Amino acid sequence: ISRAEQIFYPGWLMVSQLRSGQPVEDGKALYRRACQLVKQAREELAEAGFSQKSSDIMLYAFCALLDESVLNREWRTWQQDPLQAHFFGTLNAGEELWERIREQLKLPAPDVAVLTCLCRTLQLGFTGQYRSQDDERREDVIRALTARVPAFTFAQDAPVVVRAPGYR
Hints:
Blueprint: H1 2-19, H2 27-47, H3 52-71, H4 77-80, H5 83-87, H6 93-105, H7 112-123, H8 138-147
Protein name: Type VI secretion protein
Keywords: Membrane, Transmembrane, Transmembrane helix
Domain Type IV / VI secretion system DotU: 8-168
């Protein structure tokens, strides 16, 4: 849905700016704005008629997206207690969000709005820590998720000349 994208757009733009190495001063001031944005999104999703189930997955992916873009930045408030710990009680969102994307793909008709947010989460730079004790890889999960949403697709950059370790 678009009403869902409307709710996350300010936050999505904020993560996109943080990802582009924008000056951030202050750190604790950013965590507070982050918190208010998550709370604003929660109240708005509920007002828009979205179920707790769908609101919680959308907000989880966003918390995991925002936490990752702050921690992989060149504070210690998030390092100490991130949004995934503050709002969800986990420090393993990098791993369990991938687990959460896969169980959404196992559903015959998952909420299009949820799938949109999960695509937006990956588009803005979410990597996490993917694990799967089986034949499934990220590349395959991305393609499968991409295939079920018309608004999104996948694109690969051409290979680049890289130095070769096993040298010198």
